Amino acid sequence: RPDFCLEPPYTGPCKARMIRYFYNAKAGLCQPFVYGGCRAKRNNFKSSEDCMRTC
Amino acid sequence: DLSLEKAANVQWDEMADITGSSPIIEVKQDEDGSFSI
Amino acid sequence: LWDVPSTLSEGVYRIMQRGKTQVGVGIHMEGVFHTMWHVTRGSVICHETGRLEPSWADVRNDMISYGGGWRLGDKWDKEEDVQVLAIEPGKNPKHVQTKPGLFKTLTGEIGAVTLDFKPGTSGSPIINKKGKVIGLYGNGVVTKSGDYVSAITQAERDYEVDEDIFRKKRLTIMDLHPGAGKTKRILPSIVREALKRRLRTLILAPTRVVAAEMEEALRGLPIRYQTPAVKSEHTGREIVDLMCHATFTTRLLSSTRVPNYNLIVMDEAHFTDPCSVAARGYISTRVEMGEAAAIFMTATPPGSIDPFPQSNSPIEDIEREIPERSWNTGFDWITDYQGKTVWFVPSIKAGNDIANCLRKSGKKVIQLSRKTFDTEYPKTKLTDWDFVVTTDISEMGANFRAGRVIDPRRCLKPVILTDGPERVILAGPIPVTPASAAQRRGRIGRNPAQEDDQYVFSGDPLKNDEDHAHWTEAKMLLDNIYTPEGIIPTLFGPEREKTQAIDGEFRLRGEQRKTFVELMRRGDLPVWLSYKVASAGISYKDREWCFTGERNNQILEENMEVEIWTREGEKKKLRPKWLDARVYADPMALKDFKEFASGRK
């Protein structure tokens, strides 16, 4: 898997509320997290299928 | 597909809490509208 | 601006999704709705039995507007203390007053508030001392200390024309692509400063709905729409005339009081309809005589050759094989696609076949043709549909709200055959022109909220339209436009070599010219057939030429030799003396020509 799923989920410096998916390496799967709308990191997926296949 | 819902009219509060600091952070925005450092 | 036409209370609203939770906040000010860009990203909103679609946006400042512009211009004074009307998800609103700190942008400088509200509060308004919105909360940064700060966010509110475009004996071509603000910005400014110069302004639209969108764009200015039921309409007042290309050509052919327009603007000036070509010829004549200035607006000006031009939204150009008839299998990508599709067909017949095949799959199909366009196109807007099966007519300013185009790049071409008896056939299906392919692809790639638009095509375009009958028909119309100075009204330069005709050879004397215009207007006959009948000295009501033709001019309908009862009870075979394929090319054309040949028309 790429090194960018090493990162934990990243809520941006913005205050929207988008449900997204991020790969918990410790837990070993992408759980849903709160995306603020701005400067998304690469551990940030719109659906859990794209996150499992992308990590 | 998004829906709306009424919340409030725009009026100022005589009965408002006063909080917050007034720092001076130099920060630069980037094309997308973001902010950092 | 964006790219579309179409409750409205005032107050802050929770923008919400059903998968229901709050994702952001917005302000309904005036008849406009205000939010940050990052909250919706151009998505529609539906509430109170209504829908709002984006108008203006500034992605460089994380700001978006629905239903109009951002007139909110109250700017924080850099001292006055502010209030954030925060609306957190699942909580009654809360007013928090603070003295703002500074973000020091270094490309400028603006205030910031150090209030940390829950996710879903972006777009909450920042009010001021006087009760006016000075900003939107939600876009900020994290401090070295670990604190959250948010900047106040507000706008501060345009097309200026070059004056040489108004100079007489000047013809300007504006290569305007979808997304430039043509109807919404450029044309209103042109009209306004033309009025400032007190110019007699004519505006020409390809279709009725395009002229209606022009009316919506130009509201507040003195525009009079001109209906072809009137040969001329003059008022002493300051007025700008708006009409269709064909209406202008008709008034040229049939009226005397054609105004001395000194500024003529023609939208979608690539239209190859005979009326549009003849109007371009007359306009270029007036410009050359030093009596007017002209502006041709089109995304495919003369010399355009690129079928994949640049767009203001990404376009995915997929090349694969496309069905030409109804199919039974092996084309699952057509119906599996979950957006809206605009499919370009070569003919109304193939369009019917394709549309019925699509309807069989539970698809809502709207069909568009040259004659039914102004009737059916408003239904694509006022209704939700899966496919638009259309001919080339949708290449002239028909805006759609779709994500995919299917373009086999094929069309029918009217050709005047000179092998002995002169006739008009429909050659094809043949490859369309590069400009035609570009215009078809131009239906998409305009919504900036969509990056997944796809142009599925097959085959290469072909730049061989020289034998097209429309150029000779445009010369037929043009040679019957008498000029006061007696000048020579010829076709617009770039289109002049398309026909090897000599200028003026189709001029008809008085009465014949009247019946020519009438055969086109009342008879609904093609320009070539109308000219052939009128130049023969035949009156409008005399229908016997429809039956005195050679045996090889027999007209067939669904494998039958058409028989028609004349007005006086006689039954005769439909055998026109002059054969133009366009009168029997489709069921509606043949129906209209059958009613003409009967004299019931």
CSV table of C-alpha atoms in Angstrom, one decimal, chain C residues 229-582:
chain,number,residue,atom,x,y,z
C,229,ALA,CA,-45.7,38.2,-38.9
C,230,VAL,CA,-44.6,41.9,-39.4
C,231,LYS,CA,-42.6,43.2,-42.3
C,232,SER,CA,-41.3,46.3,-40.4
C,233,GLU,CA,-41.9,48.0,-37.1
C,234,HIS,CA,-40.4,51.5,-36.5
C,235,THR,CA,-40.9,53.6,-33.4
C,236,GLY,CA,-39.5,57.1,-32.8
C,237,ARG,CA,-38.1,55.9,-29.5
C,238,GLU,CA,-34.6,54.5,-28.6
C,239,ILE,CA,-35.0,50.8,-29.2
C,240,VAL,CA,-32.9,47.7,-29.9
C,241,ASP,CA,-34.4,45.2,-32.3
C,242,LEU,CA,-34.1,41.4,-31.5
C,243,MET,CA,-35.2,38.8,-34.1
C,244,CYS,CA,-34.2,35.5,-35.6
C,245,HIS,CA,-31.9,35.2,-38.6
C,246,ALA,CA,-34.8,33.9,-40.8
C,247,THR,CA,-37.0,36.8,-39.7
C,248,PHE,CA,-34.4,39.3,-40.8
C,249,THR,CA,-34.0,37.5,-44.2
C,250,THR,CA,-37.8,37.5,-44.6
C,251,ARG,CA,-38.1,41.2,-43.9
C,252,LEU,CA,-35.4,41.9,-46.3
C,253,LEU,CA,-37.2,39.9,-49.0
C,254,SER,CA,-40.7,41.3,-48.4
C,255,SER,CA,-40.4,44.8,-46.8
C,256,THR,CA,-39.4,48.3,-47.8
C,257,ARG,CA,-38.7,50.0,-44.5
C,258,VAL,CA,-35.7,47.9,-43.5
C,259,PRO,CA,-34.0,50.3,-41.0
C,260,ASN,CA,-30.5,51.6,-41.6
C,261,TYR,CA,-29.0,49.6,-38.8
C,262,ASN,CA,-25.5,50.7,-38.1
C,263,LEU,CA,-24.6,48.0,-35.6
C,264,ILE,CA,-25.6,44.4,-36.3
C,265,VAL,CA,-24.8,41.5,-33.9
C,266,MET,CA,-25.4,37.9,-35.1
C,267,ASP,CA,-25.2,35.2,-32.5
C,268,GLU,CA,-24.2,31.6,-33.6
C,269,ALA,CA,-23.0,33.1,-36.9
C,270,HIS,CA,-21.9,29.7,-38.1
C,271,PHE,CA,-25.5,28.7,-38.9
C,272,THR,CA,-25.5,27.3,-42.4
C,273,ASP,CA,-29.2,27.6,-42.9
C,274,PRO,CA,-29.8,29.5,-46.2
C,275,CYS,CA,-31.5,32.4,-44.3
C,276,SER,CA,-28.4,32.8,-42.0
C,277,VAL,CA,-26.0,32.7,-44.9
C,278,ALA,CA,-28.0,35.2,-46.9
C,279,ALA,CA,-28.3,37.5,-43.8
C,280,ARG,CA,-24.5,37.3,-43.4
C,281,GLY,CA,-24.1,38.3,-47.0
C,282,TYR,CA,-26.4,41.3,-46.6
C,283,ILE,CA,-24.7,42.3,-43.4
C,284,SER,CA,-21.2,42.1,-45.0
C,285,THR,CA,-22.5,44.2,-47.9
C,286,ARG,CA,-23.8,46.9,-45.5
C,287,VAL,CA,-20.5,46.8,-43.7
C,288,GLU,CA,-18.5,47.2,-46.9
C,289,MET,CA,-20.6,50.1,-48.0
C,290,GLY,CA,-19.6,51.9,-44.8
C,291,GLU,CA,-23.1,52.0,-43.4
C,292,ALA,CA,-22.8,49.7,-40.4
C,293,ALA,CA,-20.6,47.8,-38.0
C,294,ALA,CA,-21.0,44.0,-37.6
C,295,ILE,CA,-20.2,41.5,-34.9
C,296,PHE,CA,-20.4,37.7,-35.6
C,297,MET,CA,-20.4,35.6,-32.5
C,298,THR,CA,-19.5,31.9,-32.9
C,299,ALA,CA,-17.2,29.3,-31.3
C,300,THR,CA,-16.4,28.0,-34.8
C,301,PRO,CA,-15.5,31.0,-37.0
C,302,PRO,CA,-14.3,30.6,-40.6
C,303,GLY,CA,-11.1,28.5,-40.6
C,304,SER,CA,-12.0,26.5,-37.5
C,305,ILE,CA,-10.7,23.0,-38.0
C,306,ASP,CA,-10.2,21.6,-34.5
C,307,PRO,CA,-12.9,19.1,-33.5
C,308,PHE,CA,-11.6,19.0,-29.9
C,309,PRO,CA,-11.3,22.7,-28.9
C,310,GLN,CA,-10.5,23.9,-25.4
C,311,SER,CA,-13.3,24.0,-22.9
C,312,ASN,CA,-13.8,25.7,-19.5
C,313,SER,CA,-14.6,22.3,-17.9
C,314,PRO,CA,-12.8,19.0,-18.5
C,315,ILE,CA,-14.1,16.8,-21.4
C,316,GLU,CA,-13.4,13.1,-21.7
C,317,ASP,CA,-13.1,12.2,-25.4
C,318,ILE,CA,-14.0,8.5,-25.7
C,319,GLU,CA,-13.8,6.9,-29.2
C,320,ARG,CA,-15.9,3.8,-29.7
C,321,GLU,CA,-18.5,2.3,-32.0
C,322,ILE,CA,-22.0,3.8,-31.8
C,323,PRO,CA,-25.3,2.2,-33.0
C,324,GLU,CA,-26.8,3.5,-36.2
C,325,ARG,CA,-30.2,1.7,-35.6
C,326,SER,CA,-32.1,-0.1,-32.9
C,327,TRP,CA,-29.9,-2.6,-31.2
C,328,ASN,CA,-30.6,-5.8,-29.2
C,329,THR,CA,-27.4,-6.3,-27.3
C,330,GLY,CA,-23.7,-5.3,-27.0
C,331,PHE,CA,-24.2,-1.6,-26.1
C,332,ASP,CA,-24.7,-1.7,-22.3
C,333,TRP,CA,-22.6,1.4,-21.8
C,334,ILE,CA,-25.4,3.5,-23.4
C,335,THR,CA,-28.2,2.6,-20.9
C,336,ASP,CA,-25.9,1.9,-17.9
C,337,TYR,CA,-24.8,5.5,-17.9
C,338,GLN,CA,-26.7,7.2,-15.1
C,339,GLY,CA,-26.5,10.9,-16.3
C,340,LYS,CA,-28.2,12.7,-19.1
C,341,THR,CA,-27.1,12.2,-22.7
C,342,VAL,CA,-27.4,14.2,-25.9
C,343,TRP,CA,-27.3,11.9,-28.9
C,344,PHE,CA,-26.8,13.5,-32.4
C,345,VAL,CA,-28.5,11.5,-35.2
C,346,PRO,CA,-28.1,12.2,-39.0
C,347,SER,CA,-31.9,12.2,-39.7
C,348,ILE,CA,-35.3,12.3,-38.1
C,349,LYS,CA,-35.8,8.7,-39.3
C,350,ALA,CA,-32.7,7.4,-37.6
C,351,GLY,CA,-33.6,9.6,-34.6
C,352,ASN,CA,-37.0,7.9,-34.4
C,353,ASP,CA,-35.5,4.5,-34.5
C,354,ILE,CA,-32.9,5.3,-31.8
C,355,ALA,CA,-35.4,7.0,-29.6
C,356,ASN,CA,-37.9,4.1,-29.7
C,357,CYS,CA,-35.1,1.7,-28.9
C,358,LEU,CA,-34.1,3.9,-25.9
C,359,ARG,CA,-37.8,4.3,-24.8
C,360,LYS,CA,-38.0,0.5,-24.7
C,361,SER,CA,-35.5,0.5,-21.8
C,362,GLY,CA,-37.6,2.8,-19.6
C,363,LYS,CA,-35.7,5.9,-20.9
C,364,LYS,CA,-37.3,9.3,-21.0
C,365,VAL,CA,-36.4,10.4,-24.5
C,366,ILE,CA,-37.0,13.9,-25.9
C,367,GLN,CA,-36.5,14.4,-29.7
C,368,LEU,CA,-35.4,17.6,-31.4
C,369,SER,CA,-35.7,18.5,-35.0
C,370,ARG,CA,-35.4,21.8,-37.0
C,371,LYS,CA,-39.2,22.3,-37.2
C,372,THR,CA,-40.0,21.0,-33.7
C,373,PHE,CA,-37.1,22.6,-31.9
C,374,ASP,CA,-38.8,25.7,-30.6
C,375,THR,CA,-41.7,23.5,-29.4
C,376,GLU,CA,-39.8,20.7,-27.7
C,377,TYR,CA,-36.6,22.3,-26.4
C,378,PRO,CA,-38.5,24.0,-23.5
C,379,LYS,CA,-39.6,20.5,-22.4
C,380,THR,CA,-36.0,19.4,-21.8
C,381,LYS,CA,-35.7,22.3,-19.3
C,382,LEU,CA,-39.2,22.0,-17.7
C,383,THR,CA,-38.9,18.2,-17.4
C,384,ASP,CA,-36.4,15.6,-16.3
C,385,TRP,CA,-35.3,13.2,-19.1
C,386,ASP,CA,-32.6,10.6,-19.9
C,387,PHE,CA,-31.8,11.3,-23.5
C,388,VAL,CA,-32.2,14.0,-26.1
C,389,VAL,CA,-32.1,12.5,-29.6
C,390,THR,CA,-31.5,15.5,-31.9
C,391,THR,CA,-30.4,16.5,-35.4
C,392,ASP,CA,-27.8,19.2,-36.1
C,393,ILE,CA,-30.3,21.9,-35.0
C,394,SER,CA,-29.0,21.6,-31.4
C,395,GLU,CA,-25.7,22.9,-32.8
C,396,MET,CA,-27.0,26.5,-32.6
C,397,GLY,CA,-26.9,27.7,-28.9
C,398,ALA,CA,-29.1,24.9,-27.4
C,399,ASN,CA,-27.8,24.8,-23.8
C,400,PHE,CA,-28.3,21.4,-22.1
C,401,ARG,CA,-27.7,20.3,-18.5
C,402,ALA,CA,-26.1,16.9,-19.4
C,403,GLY,CA,-22.9,15.0,-18.8
C,404,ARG,CA,-22.5,13.0,-22.0
C,405,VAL,CA,-22.7,13.5,-25.7
C,406,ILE,CA,-23.0,10.6,-28.3
C,407,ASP,CA,-21.8,11.8,-31.7
C,408,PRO,CA,-21.5,9.3,-34.6
C,409,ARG,CA,-20.4,12.4,-36.6
C,410,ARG,CA,-22.9,11.8,-39.4
C,411,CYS,CA,-25.4,13.9,-41.2
C,412,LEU,CA,-27.5,14.2,-44.4
C,413,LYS,CA,-26.5,16.8,-47.0
C,414,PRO,CA,-28.9,18.4,-49.5
C,415,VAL,CA,-27.2,18.4,-52.9
C,416,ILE,CA,-28.4,20.0,-56.1
C,417,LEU,CA,-27.8,17.5,-58.9
C,418,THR,CA,-27.1,18.8,-62.4
C,419,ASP,CA,-27.1,15.5,-64.3
C,420,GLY,CA,-29.8,16.5,-66.8
C,421,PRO,CA,-32.9,17.3,-64.9
C,422,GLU,CA,-32.0,19.5,-61.9
C,423,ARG,CA,-33.1,17.9,-58.6
C,424,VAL,CA,-32.2,18.0,-54.9
C,425,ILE,CA,-31.2,14.8,-53.1
C,426,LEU,CA,-30.1,14.0,-49.6
C,427,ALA,CA,-26.7,12.5,-49.8
C,428,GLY,CA,-25.5,10.4,-46.8
C,429,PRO,CA,-25.2,9.7,-44.0
C,430,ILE,CA,-21.8,11.4,-44.4
C,431,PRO,CA,-19.1,12.7,-42.0
C,432,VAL,CA,-20.0,16.0,-40.5
C,433,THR,CA,-17.6,18.9,-40.7
C,434,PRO,CA,-14.9,19.6,-38.0
C,435,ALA,CA,-16.8,22.7,-36.9
C,436,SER,CA,-20.0,20.6,-36.7
C,437,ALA,CA,-18.3,18.0,-34.5
C,438,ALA,CA,-16.8,20.8,-32.4
C,439,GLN,CA,-20.3,22.4,-31.9
C,440,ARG,CA,-21.8,19.0,-31.0
C,441,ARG,CA,-19.0,18.3,-28.5
C,442,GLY,CA,-19.7,21.9,-27.1
C,443,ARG,CA,-23.0,20.8,-25.6
C,444,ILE,CA,-20.9,19.6,-22.6
C,445,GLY,CA,-17.7,20.8,-20.9
C,446,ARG,CA,-19.4,23.9,-19.5
C,447,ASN,CA,-20.6,23.0,-16.0
C,448,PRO,CA,-17.6,23.8,-13.7
C,449,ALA,CA,-19.1,21.6,-10.9
C,450,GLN,CA,-18.8,18.6,-13.2
C,451,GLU,CA,-15.4,17.1,-14.4
C,452,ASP,CA,-16.8,13.8,-15.6
C,453,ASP,CA,-18.3,15.0,-18.9
C,454,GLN,CA,-17.7,12.6,-21.8
C,455,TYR,CA,-17.9,13.0,-25.5
C,456,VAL,CA,-18.3,9.5,-27.0
C,457,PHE,CA,-17.7,9.6,-30.8
C,458,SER,CA,-17.0,7.5,-33.8
C,459,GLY,CA,-15.4,8.4,-37.2
C,460,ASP,CA,-13.4,11.4,-38.5
C,461,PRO,CA,-14.9,14.7,-39.7
C,462,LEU,CA,-14.7,15.8,-43.3
C,463,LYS,CA,-14.3,19.3,-44.7
C,464,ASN,CA,-16.1,18.8,-48.0
C,465,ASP,CA,-19.4,20.8,-47.8
C,466,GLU,CA,-18.8,22.5,-51.2
C,467,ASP,CA,-21.7,20.8,-52.9
C,468,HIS,CA,-24.1,21.7,-50.1
C,469,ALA,CA,-27.3,23.1,-51.6
C,470,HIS,CA,-27.6,25.8,-48.9
C,471,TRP,CA,-25.0,28.0,-50.6
C,472,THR,CA,-26.9,28.1,-53.9
C,473,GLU,CA,-30.1,28.6,-51.9
C,474,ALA,CA,-28.5,31.5,-50.0
C,475,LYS,CA,-27.6,33.1,-53.3
C,476,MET,CA,-31.2,32.6,-54.5
C,477,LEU,CA,-32.4,34.5,-51.4
C,478,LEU,CA,-29.7,37.1,-51.6
C,479,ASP,CA,-30.1,37.9,-55.3
C,480,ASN,CA,-33.7,38.9,-54.4
C,481,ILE,CA,-32.7,41.4,-51.8
C,482,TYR,CA,-32.9,44.7,-53.7
C,483,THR,CA,-30.6,47.5,-52.4
C,484,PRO,CA,-31.4,51.2,-52.5
C,485,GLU,CA,-27.8,52.0,-53.7
C,486,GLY,CA,-28.2,49.2,-56.3
C,487,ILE,CA,-25.0,47.6,-54.8
C,488,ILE,CA,-24.1,44.0,-55.2
C,489,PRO,CA,-25.2,41.9,-52.2
C,490,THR,CA,-23.0,38.8,-52.2
C,491,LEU,CA,-22.3,36.1,-49.8
C,492,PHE,CA,-20.0,36.6,-46.8
C,493,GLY,CA,-16.4,36.3,-48.0
C,494,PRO,CA,-15.4,33.0,-46.4
C,495,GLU,CA,-18.5,31.4,-47.7
C,496,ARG,CA,-18.4,33.0,-51.2
C,497,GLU,CA,-16.3,30.3,-52.9
C,498,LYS,CA,-18.7,27.6,-51.8
C,499,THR,CA,-20.9,28.3,-54.9
C,500,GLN,CA,-19.6,29.0,-58.4
C,501,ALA,CA,-22.8,31.0,-59.2
C,502,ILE,CA,-22.7,34.5,-60.7
C,503,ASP,CA,-24.1,37.2,-58.4
C,504,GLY,CA,-27.6,38.3,-59.3
C,505,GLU,CA,-28.7,35.4,-61.6
C,506,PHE,CA,-31.6,34.4,-59.4
C,507,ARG,CA,-33.2,37.8,-59.4
C,508,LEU,CA,-37.0,37.5,-60.0
C,509,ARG,CA,-39.2,40.2,-61.3
C,510,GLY,CA,-41.8,41.6,-58.9
C,511,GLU,CA,-44.7,39.1,-58.9
C,512,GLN,CA,-42.5,36.0,-59.2
C,513,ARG,CA,-40.5,37.2,-56.3
C,514,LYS,CA,-43.7,37.6,-54.2
C,515,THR,CA,-44.8,34.0,-55.0
C,516,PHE,CA,-41.2,32.8,-54.2
C,517,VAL,CA,-41.4,34.4,-50.7
C,518,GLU,CA,-45.0,33.0,-50.3
C,519,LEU,CA,-44.1,29.5,-51.4
C,520,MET,CA,-41.4,29.6,-48.7
C,521,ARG,CA,-43.6,31.2,-46.0
C,522,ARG,CA,-47.0,29.8,-46.6
C,523,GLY,CA,-46.0,26.6,-48.5
C,524,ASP,CA,-43.1,25.7,-46.2
C,525,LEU,CA,-41.2,24.6,-49.2
C,526,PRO,CA,-37.4,24.6,-49.5
C,527,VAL,CA,-35.7,27.6,-51.2
C,528,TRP,CA,-34.6,25.6,-54.2
C,529,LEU,CA,-38.1,24.1,-54.9
C,530,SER,CA,-39.8,27.5,-54.2
C,531,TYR,CA,-37.4,29.3,-56.6
C,532,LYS,CA,-37.9,26.6,-59.3
C,533,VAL,CA,-41.7,27.0,-59.1
C,534,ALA,CA,-41.9,30.8,-58.8
C,535,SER,CA,-39.4,31.5,-61.6
C,536,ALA,CA,-41.5,29.3,-63.8
C,537,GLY,CA,-44.3,31.9,-63.5
C,538,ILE,CA,-46.6,29.6,-61.5
C,539,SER,CA,-48.9,31.2,-59.0
C,540,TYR,CA,-48.9,30.2,-55.4
C,541,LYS,CA,-52.3,28.5,-55.4
C,542,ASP,CA,-51.7,26.6,-58.7
C,543,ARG,CA,-50.8,23.1,-57.6
C,544,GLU,CA,-50.7,21.2,-60.9
C,545,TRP,CA,-46.9,21.2,-61.1
C,546,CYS,CA,-47.1,18.7,-58.2
C,547,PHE,CA,-48.5,16.0,-60.5
C,548,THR,CA,-47.1,16.7,-64.0
C,549,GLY,CA,-43.7,15.2,-63.3
C,550,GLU,CA,-41.6,12.5,-64.9
C,551,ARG,CA,-42.4,9.0,-63.8
C,552,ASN,CA,-39.1,8.9,-61.9
C,553,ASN,CA,-40.4,11.8,-59.8
C,554,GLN,CA,-43.0,9.5,-58.2
C,555,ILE,CA,-42.9,10.0,-54.4
C,556,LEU,CA,-43.0,6.9,-52.2
C,557,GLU,CA,-44.3,6.6,-48.7
C,558,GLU,CA,-43.5,3.4,-46.8
C,559,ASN,CA,-43.0,1.5,-50.0
C,560,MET,CA,-46.2,2.9,-51.6
C,561,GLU,CA,-46.7,5.2,-54.6
C,562,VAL,CA,-48.4,8.2,-52.9
C,563,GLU,CA,-51.8,9.0,-54.3
C,564,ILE,CA,-53.4,12.3,-53.2
C,565,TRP,CA,-56.9,13.7,-53.7
C,566,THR,CA,-56.8,17.2,-55.1
C,567,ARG,CA,-59.0,20.0,-53.9
C,568,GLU,CA,-61.5,19.4,-56.7
C,569,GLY,CA,-62.0,15.7,-55.9
C,570,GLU,CA,-59.5,14.3,-58.4
C,571,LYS,CA,-57.2,11.5,-57.3
C,572,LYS,CA,-53.7,11.7,-58.7
C,573,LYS,CA,-50.2,10.3,-58.1
C,574,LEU,CA,-47.8,12.6,-56.3
C,575,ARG,CA,-45.3,13.3,-59.1
C,576,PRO,CA,-43.8,16.7,-58.8
C,577,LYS,CA,-42.3,18.4,-61.8
C,578,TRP,CA,-39.3,19.3,-59.6
C,579,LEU,CA,-38.1,16.8,-57.1
C,580,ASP,CA,-36.6,18.0,-53.8
C,581,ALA,CA,-36.0,15.2,-51.4
C,582,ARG,CA,-36.5,17.3,-48.3
